Homo-oligomer: A and B are copies of this chain.
Amino acid sequence: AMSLENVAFNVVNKGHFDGQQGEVPVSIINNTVYTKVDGVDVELFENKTTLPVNVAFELWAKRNIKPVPEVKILNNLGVDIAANTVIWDYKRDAPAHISTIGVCSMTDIAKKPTETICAPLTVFFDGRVDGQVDLFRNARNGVLITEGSVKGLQPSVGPKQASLNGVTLIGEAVKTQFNYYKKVDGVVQQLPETYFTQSRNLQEFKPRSQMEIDFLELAMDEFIERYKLEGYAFEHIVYGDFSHSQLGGLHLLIGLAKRFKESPFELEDFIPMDSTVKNYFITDAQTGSSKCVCSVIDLLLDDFVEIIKSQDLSVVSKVVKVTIDYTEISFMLWCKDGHVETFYPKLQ
């Protein structure tokens, strides 16, 4: 017996939908859900989605509260829909997926992923839930996560981090590193060898290697000397050039982190979604150097160094393809006289 008032009862009493019986009085006004506590209205939910307020409220209440893959990983693997859960996208304040399976009468296209409507969709399955590995084996199209071996299925070791109630973290009390599997058109697909983005924020950035500690602590010239980076244009690509009206380079999050400690800047996140590569309109507060589309990726600096040192430096310009978060990220590499001029995630 699903009901708005039952969803609200669960949110008030359990902090999320927990299948408990009960009802509280609700008022809906515009995109806000309220409940009456002792004669006054208390806000339970503000709809930021393109769904109806009461529907969004239910999907949010029914959000997966276990560690789940970051939405950028799901998107990069082509996930269309989840089996019997909601992956809440905390970057969009909205469901990661438009439709559901066995969650909500307004958004369900099916009660179970075995229904024929689901066959052409890439369904996300969670091996931590009884039955879902089997549903994956039966599905035409899917992505599966597990905490361990699945007999006969060749695994891909995923990122260390996952999202737990919108907090990206490397679990200590809980497991966040999953095996991944994918099927297309009834056929298990070998996932590519990949780097993973580190999913750090500017404000709480922490180095995760001696090389990153050195980059944050050393001055530019000593770091470049110590790690033999002469001719790799880290002065432009990583450290950034704030000397002209157009901000030069600055494509690695650690480089933004180092600048940020010294002087503040504005990052306008003009397409605010989770993605392997982020684009910001950056305005440097100290200098007034700015750039409308500054592509930024959070690679471990050691991974970026491995990538750039792996490149042939003998052509003027070429597209370099690097597998990151399971997706092919195109970089533009510009060279002159066997040194790098710039290397950036290629703007589409």
Closest Cβ–Cβ distance, residue A179 to chain B (whole Å): 18
Q: Is A152 part of the binding interface, using a Cβ–Cβ cutoff of 8 Å?
A: no
Docked complex Cα distance between A285 and B243 (Å): 37
By beta carbon, the residue of chain B nearest A273 is: B42
Grouping DSSP codes into helix (H, G, I), strand (E, B) and loop, the A interface class, with mixed when no group exceeds half, is loop
Q: Is A319 part of the binding interface, using a Cβ–Cβ cutoff of 8 Å?
A: no
Interface-located stretch among A30-38, A187-195, A219-227, A296-304: A30-38
Q: Flag if A171 contacts B287 (CB, 8 Å).
A: yes
Docked complex Cα distance between A31 and B28 (Å): 9
Q: Flag if A25 contacts B120 (CB, 8 Å).
A: no
How many residues from A make CB contacts under 8 Å with B?
96
Interface-located stretch among A15-23, A251-259, A334-342: A15-23
Interface-located stretch among A44-52, A129-137, A208-216, A310-318: A44-52
CB neighbours of A92 from chain B (8 A): 40-43
Once A54-B4, A283-B165 are accepted as A-B contacts, the answer to whether A288 and B174 lie under 8 Å apart by CB is: yes
CB neighbours of A53 from chain B (8 A): 28-29
Q: Flag if B31 contacts A271 (CB, 8 Å).
A: no
Q: Flag if A2 contacts B23 (CB, 8 Å).
A: yes
Q: Flag if A1 contacts B4 (CB, 8 Å).
A: no
Which residues, 329 to 348 on A, are CB-close (under 8 Å) to B? 347-348
> Can you name 19 extra interface pairs (CB under 8 A) apart from A13-B347, A16-B292?
A2-B5, A4-B26, A15-B268, A15-B280, A15-B281, A23-B105, A25-B106, A27-B50, A28-B54, A30-B30, A34-B50, A34-B52, A39-B98, A40-B97, A41-B92, A67-B288, A165-B266, A165-B268, A172-B286
Residues of A that sit less than 8 Å from B by CB: 1-6, 11-16, 18, 23-31, 34-44, 48-50, 52-55, 65, 67, 75, 80, 89, 92, 94-98, 105-106, 116-117, 120, 164-167, 169-174, 176, 204, 242-245, 247, 264-266, 268, 270-273, 279-281, 283-290, 292-293, 347-348
